[PDB]
Amino acid sequence: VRPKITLACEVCKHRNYITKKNRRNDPDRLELKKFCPNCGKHQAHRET
Amino acid sequence: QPRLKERYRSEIRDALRKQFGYGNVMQIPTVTKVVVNMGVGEAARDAKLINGAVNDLALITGQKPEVRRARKSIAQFKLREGMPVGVRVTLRGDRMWEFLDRLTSIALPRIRDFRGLSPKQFDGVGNYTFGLAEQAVFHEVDVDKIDRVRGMDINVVTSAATDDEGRALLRALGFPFK
Amino acid sequence: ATRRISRLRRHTRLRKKLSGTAERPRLVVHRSARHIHVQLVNDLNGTTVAAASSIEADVRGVPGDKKARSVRVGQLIAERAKAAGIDTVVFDRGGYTYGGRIAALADAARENGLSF
Amino acid sequence: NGRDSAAQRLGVKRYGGQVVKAGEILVRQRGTKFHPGVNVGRGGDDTLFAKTAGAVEFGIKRGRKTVSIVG
């Protein structure tokens, strides 16, 4: 119901963050802006 | 310019001053606001009052009303928290003046079996309340495009501190009492 | 009455997180329908170090309206603060919303030298 | 019956007049039974640590019991 999801940088595709969400409440892929250590700044992240 | 407001400022203020010996000019009673609300019962059933209440109150008054949602949950009324049960608007200033003038002129005499507003429905502080029970006779709304019938209530709030002063102010403004 | 109470409520709420020290005093404001007032408090001993208002020669030295008067008194209080030896302060809304006369006061002081 | 939870070792850790170092925990508590004063932070779980070296000082701030550090 609340699985563990991973967020990858939209640019370098590196997996940087893991978290949870409600599958029914957000049936589509989560989108967030998070700091990417590899890119050196904040980039958009999407579920994998 | 609101003719009822002009008539008030011309003679009603002096009349109230004669009736009650106020020591200062701003101790004279004055109407503050007029509030009209629905309080519909179709909140738990069919939930369609935006067209049932707002669309008519806006044209009746002159401003779109505010939606009031349930403050609690009642099983007996099938009342849940969070859905609208009533729609309230308040009229102030020249809009209130025009609304009161139009009411007292053409709307109040024009309902079924108009025998006059009871002068005993005051709240004890100087503000009056009365309400109808159907789609009012306002010429702004016609039967040809209305849903199920619903009535409304008016709260008129005055600067008066006593029921007698409020009644005198309403009588001078033109409220037909017994 | 109720306006006074609500203004005091809002001022206390904002002051909960905002004190102002000797080195960084409090740019407090006090606006009326006819005038405004401003002073630096240094909320460590309750000792005002600089003050200004709209009742001075500026009450007739008016190039416009209440906003122009607020600009002028902002320049005046900035000069008073520089004379005192103050270059960093904390702006206190006084419970009024930021903008208008208050904004004119604030930015007048800002480009007149205060670093807040 | 028969169940229980661990004792959490709450309470005052440093008392009035004690000399403390920066960051020393002073009061472990649930909620703000005491309130942070000058040179005293709160912490994510109402922990009332010391932000500076000094001596502890308990006081009153119009109803709230406060803990402060004097340098």
Binding site: - | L59, E98, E140 | - | -
Partner: protein
Amino acid sequence: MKSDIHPAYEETTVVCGCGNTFQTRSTKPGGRIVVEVCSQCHPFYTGGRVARFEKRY
């Protein structure tokens, strides 16, 4: 907020069969309103068994 929310409130004029006519600002109807009774003409604003047996017999 009065941009598109509130209904139109424009000057109007009330014409009554009695003759009592005044002009105010009303809602979406911009034209006239035709009425047959006003405050100046409506009622309430301008104001035996033994006898039946006697007239029967």
